[PDB]
Amino acid sequence: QISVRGLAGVENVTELKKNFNRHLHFTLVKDRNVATPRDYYFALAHTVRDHLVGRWIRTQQHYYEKDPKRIYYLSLEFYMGRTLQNTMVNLALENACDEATYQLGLDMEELEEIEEDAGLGNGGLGRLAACFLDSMATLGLAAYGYGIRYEFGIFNQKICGGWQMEEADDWLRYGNPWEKARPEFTLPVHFYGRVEHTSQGAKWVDTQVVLAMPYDTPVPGYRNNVVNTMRLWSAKAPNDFNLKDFNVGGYIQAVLDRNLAENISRVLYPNDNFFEGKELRLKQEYFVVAATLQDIIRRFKSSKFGCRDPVRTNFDAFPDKVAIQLNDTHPSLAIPELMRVLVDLERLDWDKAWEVTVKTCAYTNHTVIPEALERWPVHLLETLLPRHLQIIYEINQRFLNRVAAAFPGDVDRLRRMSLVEEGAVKRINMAHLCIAGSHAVNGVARIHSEILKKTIFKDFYELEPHKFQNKTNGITPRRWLVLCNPGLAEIIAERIGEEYISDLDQLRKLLSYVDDEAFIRDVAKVKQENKLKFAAYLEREYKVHINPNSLFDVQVKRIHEYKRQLLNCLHVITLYNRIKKEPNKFVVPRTVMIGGKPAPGYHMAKMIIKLITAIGDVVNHDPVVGDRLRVIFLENYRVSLAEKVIPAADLSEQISTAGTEASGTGNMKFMLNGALTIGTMDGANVEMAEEAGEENFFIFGMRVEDVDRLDQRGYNAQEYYDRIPELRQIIEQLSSGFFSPKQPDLFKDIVNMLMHHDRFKVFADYEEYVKCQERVSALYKNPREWTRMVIRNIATSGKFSSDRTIAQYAREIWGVEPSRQRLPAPDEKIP
Amino acid sequence: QISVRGLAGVENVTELKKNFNRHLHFTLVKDRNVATPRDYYFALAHTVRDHLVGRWIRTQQHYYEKDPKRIYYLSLEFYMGRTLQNTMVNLALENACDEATYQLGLDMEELEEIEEDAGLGNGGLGRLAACFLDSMATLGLAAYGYGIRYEFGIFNQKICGGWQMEEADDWLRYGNPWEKARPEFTLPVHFYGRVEHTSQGAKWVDTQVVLAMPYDTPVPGYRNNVVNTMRLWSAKAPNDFNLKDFNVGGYIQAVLDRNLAENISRVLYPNDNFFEGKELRLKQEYFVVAATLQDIIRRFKSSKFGCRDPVRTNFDAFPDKVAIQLNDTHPSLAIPELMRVLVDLERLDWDKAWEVTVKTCAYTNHTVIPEALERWPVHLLETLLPRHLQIIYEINQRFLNRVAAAFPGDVDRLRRMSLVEEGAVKRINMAHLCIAGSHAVNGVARIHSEILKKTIFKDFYELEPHKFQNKTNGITPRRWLVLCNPGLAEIIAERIGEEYISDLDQLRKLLSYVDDEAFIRDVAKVKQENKLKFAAYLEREYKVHINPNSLFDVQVKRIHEYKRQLLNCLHVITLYNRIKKEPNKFVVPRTVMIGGKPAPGYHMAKMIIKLITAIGDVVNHDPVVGDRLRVIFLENYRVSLAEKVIPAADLSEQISTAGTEASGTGNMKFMLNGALTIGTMDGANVEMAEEAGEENFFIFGMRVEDVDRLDQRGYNAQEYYDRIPELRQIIEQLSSGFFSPKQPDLFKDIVNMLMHHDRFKVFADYEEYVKCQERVSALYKNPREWTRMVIRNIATSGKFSSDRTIAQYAREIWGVEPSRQRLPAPDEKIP
Ligand SMILES: *Cc1c(COP(=O)(O)O)cnc(C)c1O
Numbered sequence A, B: 001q002i003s004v005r006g007l008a009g010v011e012n013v014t015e016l017k018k019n020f021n022r023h024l025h026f027t028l029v030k031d032r033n034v035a036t037p038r039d040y041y042f043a044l045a046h047t048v049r050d051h052l053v054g055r056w057i058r059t060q061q062h063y064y065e066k067d068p069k070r071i072y073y074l075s076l077e078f079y080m081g082r083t084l085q086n087t088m089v090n091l092a093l094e095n096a097c098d099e100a101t102y103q104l105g106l107d108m109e110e111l112e113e114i115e116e117d118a119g120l121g122n123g124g125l126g127r128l129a130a131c132f133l134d135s136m137a138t139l140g141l142a143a144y145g146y147g148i149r150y151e152f153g154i155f156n157q158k159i160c161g162g163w164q165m166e167e168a169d170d171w172l173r174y175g176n177p178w179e180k181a182r183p184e185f186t187l188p189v190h191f192y193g194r195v196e197h198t199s200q201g202a203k204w205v206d207t208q209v210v211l212a213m214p215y216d217t218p219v220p221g222y223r224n225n226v227v228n229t230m231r232l233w234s235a236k237a238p239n240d241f242n243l244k245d246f247n248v249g250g251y252i253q254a255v256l257d258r259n260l261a262e263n264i265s266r267v268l269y270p271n272d273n274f275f276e277g278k279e280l281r282l283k284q285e286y287f288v289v290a291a292t293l294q295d296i297i298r299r300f301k302s303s304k305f306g307c308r309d310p311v312r313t314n315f316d317a318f319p320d321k322v323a324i325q326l327n328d329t330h331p332s333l334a335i336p337e338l339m340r341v342l343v344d345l346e347r348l349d350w351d352k353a354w355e356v357t358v359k360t361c362a363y364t365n366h367t368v369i370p371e372a373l374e375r376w377p378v379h380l381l382e383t384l385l386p387r388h389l390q391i392i393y394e395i396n397q398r399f400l401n402r403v404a405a406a407f408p409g410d411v412d413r414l415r416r417m418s419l420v421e422e423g424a425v426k427r428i429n430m431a432h433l434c435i436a437g438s439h440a441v442n443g444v445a446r447i448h449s450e451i452l453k454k455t456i457f458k459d460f461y462e463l464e465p466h467k468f469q470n471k472t473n474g475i476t477p478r479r480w481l482v483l484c485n486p487g488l489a490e491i492i493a494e495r496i497g498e499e500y501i502s503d504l505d506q507l508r509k510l511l512s513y514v515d516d517e518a519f520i521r522d523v524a525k526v527k528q529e530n531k532l533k534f535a536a537y538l539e540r541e542y543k544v545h546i547n548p549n550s551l552f553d554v555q556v557k558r559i560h561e562y563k564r565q566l567l568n569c570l571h572v573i574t575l576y577n578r579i580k581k582e583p584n585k586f587v588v589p590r591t592v593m594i595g596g597k598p599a600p601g602y603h604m605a606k607m608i609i610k611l612i613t614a615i616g617d618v619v620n621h622d623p624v625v626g627d628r629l630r631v632i633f634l635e636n637y638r639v640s641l642a643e644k645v646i647p648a649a650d651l652s653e654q655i656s657t658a659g660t661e662a663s664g665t666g667n668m669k670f671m672l673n674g675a676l677t678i679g680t681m682d683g684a685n686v687e688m689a690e691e692a693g694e695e696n697f698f699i700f701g702m703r704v705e706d707v708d709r710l711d712q713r714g715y716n717a718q719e720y721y722d723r724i725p726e727l728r729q730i731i732e733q734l735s736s737g738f739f740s741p742k743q744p745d746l747f748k749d750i751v752n753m754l755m756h757h758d759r760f761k762v763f764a765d766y767e768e769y770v771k772c773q774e775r776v777s778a779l780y781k782n783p784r785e786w787t788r789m790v791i792r793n794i795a796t797s798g799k800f801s802s803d804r805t806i807a808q809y810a811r812e813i814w815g816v817e818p819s820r821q822r823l824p825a826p827d828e829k830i831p
């Protein structure tokens, strides 16, 4: 066998080679003698896409005949990655396409590397939305993902001289085989304008019009013939006023200025956990909300209502036919917008319209760090969206009256709960708009949802306890096991079968093989094969050598002070310093690989990439160190690079200050792929250690209590400097130019910060972190017992499947039951 | 029979219905129950496009194995119109697709109306280039059309309140089924920068880079299996410097500013016979030249040279493998650019490089009116293209030295011939660069090429007589007979066969039926059927009724003072005035239809559209006139509207002041479609009257001699005003608000101009024009004898085929022999 990537059947390997040669000639208009690997990749992309249009068309007509409650997942980010392999996995096409291209004389693997990632996300948030869409289609949900088809996704990172250089991601330069533009369904979105209060309504008048044109991408569930839809809006100028708001300027200039309306979907904002209050961002937020709500209401007005049902467009059943989920506060304008359409256009009374709005909306909060929070200045909302500010003031008015009635006399509560923040500039607090206008609010890991109830939304929890929930994040076992680690999925499937791919709790059955000797050597063999293949990819695409027999220590995630790549840096420098001190003493060899992108304006995260490259500069060229220690910055980290490094890791760094990483999902990916975790009791590390047992994890540090104790006291970093010689030695190395010789003051900003303004108190966890790291090296030395802990982690990772998450969203927030029932075939059909 | 639009064969009607249902499902991802006519149009467009990719691939590999001399036709305009029907005509698919969609229950005609015109031209020039491409593919020439893929072609004209309103032509909103993007073949184009003169060369340094990405459209010859290529460049920003010319500005802003480089192909300049010296226009001109020349040289470096031939890249054979034709001076920078690449990059000596450049280039001049002429200010060329200005100064230097040697002492000649014009601003005269750097210069009709030799390029003709040629324009019989007038092509084909479609001189054989009674009634019957169908289309898409039993008097062309829609206006007002004077006197009924677009800044042409609508306002609502006279402005005139009005015309207006319309091609279209011509002895009207006999035409007016006599004297329009009461009456009607009641001064600008600054002396031809118009009404009254003159014109129109024009370009300028040999089948094949 190759692996169990499906059957390579006789009629179907021949079917696929026929269609591959059809598309190269008819679609690509190339012949075999001028086709490059890229043309061969497109011939394949088109042949696999033909296998899901049958199922797409019949999944959509099915939701039309039966009319289930529809789930609208609204996100400004969807981080899909590449879609050829994933689509072959979900349709069971992967071995038939492997044989078929083999017979055509091509390497499928070589062609899969040609696909550009769809990079429409920054990281965690965007990828949670792509893992969610996979699980909704796998669980038979009538679900729709909605977002912006950005033409430039997250920048490609280049390192020049150790510094990040950002360059535009032109992911569409060659085309996207997977979208279907739907210009028939373009919709108008209004901006600026003013409100006339006339007789039987307010009206929004003298608005600028932008057209939202849809592009649909298919989302296939795993082996069940459901193919749901991701619809992504693109901005288009009208050809009228963007031209005929006549009377000199210039004709050519009017046409060139069209790219003013079309700039709304041009580029993703490259910030992860940081709010920039730019007008273009708010235009992006209103545009995906306005266009999506029109499409939603349009579908509901057909339903079985636009036939009969009671007969009246009674929006009373709108919540029993519509669930819209808000992915963070970025689509929060869906609350005042659903109100506007219903009061202003459909003419419902306010209070009916408000009951229908809270009953269909639900809000997911993703972080508690204050600079991530949206607080949009009122003059901005006032200019651009004047009806919506009025609706926000009226919602506020009425909500604070409920607070006043329940907490009579508590005047500080009222100022603390207001959706309107007074101050220098007044602002609207979008998270407050979202708790007031949603029937459910949830965090993303059990400790983060407890921190919401206890600290940041405590007033809101005391008011309406029944709204706050938890739904711990997950990861999809299809890309994150079966696709990136087929060998591990194989050796698992040999022992327990293939039903675990859509039932990840079945992995508990591996616990019976924790003492099976053939299993332990197999598990250790695929990890070694992954390490060898990544070690190779590295000299191929990017390198000057590494050693596959070392511990692969990796921390790959966005560069932030709260995720503390700096604490990892302090640990690498220690290791170096100890082996400069005792050169001929044995130490377990490590390749520590750190990678991630910094948002362009985040000066400290840019300085941290520069420190990591400066350490590898020194460490990787010291001869006394030899191959005992290598430090590597993993360039342009993205979804496809994660599918290559996470199978190859031995140790996962999940080192954020307790209370700052709300969940994390990279931690989950590493746990089902055979890495052991070194982490703090933060986010979902706590539920993972509870699932594997704390003995099967390396936890260290401060807990949330201890962080708050320290903050009661006052964190003084000099106390640590003064008491720990190894820590002291490192800072004066940074401070004197040991690591930056030509530019000795270069790192003074990291030193000054760590010493005087460290928000994430890197020094407080340093002692217990280098002690915990001594413990993992000790165990790496006992291969057999490292692999049995690995086994304890894999067999215990099934809780962290996004199928478990989506089934709890479905039941406890959406009111819909998941299915795992194969939809009636693909079978051809024309009606 | 339906007509002879090919066979509707059994295996092939079934082949086409299979493929139509394949594309609607697999390409369009629609099913029969949600498909609109537009989806049905795309299913068809894709099924007919599959039939020419076989022939395209094998026509191109054929020119590769046999390696003929290649003809590069460089134009900034290609006015293609719609391409579904035209492609069905050239592949003999039209009746099989008619039966196939009929069986599917659809009307092909209804779907053909859904296609948007490719409007990448202003009129005459752009359409001559589309008629040329058809004839080169029909004559087996290895020819390539090269231009800019503008994303906005010529604006769509809207009339509000009688005024033209321009709106952006978003022809690509729904997609173009016919192009194939070729992003693999993107090429760099450089701008700005500076020149370093270093040791063994000048170098062009610190340039801004724009990428030219190609899009190929197929050009099928008529029924010969040749499918040539039209390649159209699109501008794309690099993702490097258009981003990493680093150091603050803003990351988002850098990505948004990409549409600064991409504005180069955004919109066609909407000016016909008028030069605007805007920097964006010159960027458009360099960009199609730079990118095209790279592709040209790239193809030549493979040829049989990049194998062996002598062995050295001896550019000596470049003229024997390459012909590049300059369509007007818009690609004139192809001369200094071919020099730059050869001296600066390929390191040929100047004089070898100059001999190779003049021997491969040829220039077509299209007009003598002075404001149409390109004279680019030197500070513009100096900034943007500094190497090329140096090369232009060196070419000038050397050319004037040849003039000095031949005309010793003639110092005025030298200042008159210079490519550099001194004055207020120095300018480069692009037409002079083109005669100096081309081995052939030609005009477009016999009198226009005589006017070039006698007036505008007289000095150049005395210097190098052997360069000046004539190549009278033509029209393609495939769109302009067979496609727009199938009934006329039928009744012709009944009598003489179908070989005339690629041999239009065979139409002379209709002269034997000028007295055949069945033929005369047939010819009269298709004209009546065309008139009925256009009269219908009109109430459908646009109307409030016309009478098909009147003479259809039409003048449809761009609005210009030289084409004199104003003289036609004077004639309509006369007719009205005479029948207000004698109400109960019979006059032959006329529907006079005038249509065309005005360039946006051309205030007088905009005022002329407004006069025409103001006349129809009055005339079409006078009850005394009844249906004896209707005046209609034919909105948004373009290629597809021409295919509908020109079959339906009885009389063609070709009324420009002698010496101003260099050729005209609308005049030709009307002559093979059964309209009689009222015209002056201008452009190609002279060769048409010479071909049908002046008895078979209505010529009037001043000849060129008489225009110059009048200009020797001094044209005084008041002399006409004073002597012709009917003319006098009209001007005081204009002047008093008879035609503009609420705004009595509205037309004072037309009056003031006609009276004091008429360049095209509208009043001098007025008497002989209304007398000639009395003669055509007299003959319309004798139906039998109108149709025998019509017959004398049709049978005599074969000279005016673009197949005759291209065969004289081929033989007398390009050095290649036309073929009419069917290329070896389409037959499948994979190598
Ligand atoms: C999963 C993923 C993330 C999230 O990882 P965390 O460690 O939770 O921050 C970010 N980026 C990429 C490319 C990922 O695949």
Ligand SMILES: *Cc1c(COP(=O)(O)O)cnc(C)c1O
Pocket (backbone or CB within 6 Å): B122, B123, B124, B127, B556, B557, B558, B637, B638, B639, B642, B663, B664, B665, B666, B667, B669
């Ligand atoms: C052929 C054509 C022209 C040229 O007509 P002239 O009468 O020579 O000016 C212009 N516009 C359209 C749409 C045409 O088809």
Ligand SMILES: OC[C@@H]1[C@@H](O)[C@H](O)[C@@H](O)c2nnnn21
Pocket (backbone or CB within 6 Å): A124, A125, A126, A128, A273, A366, A367, A444, A473, A661, A662, A663, A664, A665, A683
């Ligand atoms: O919920 C998905 C991820 C969480 O796992 C991260 O911990 C948190 O920082 C975040 N912010 N936005 N999206 N996310």
Ligand SMILES: OC[C@@H]1[C@@H](O)[C@H](O)[C@@H](O)c2nnnn21
Pocket (backbone or CB within 6 Å): B124, B125, B126, B128, B273, B366, B367, B444, B473, B661, B662, B663, B664, B665, B683
């Ligand atoms: O050659 C094609 C046509 C001629 O027929 C016109 O008479 C002339 O005004 C023109 N200018 N540019 N292109 N053209």
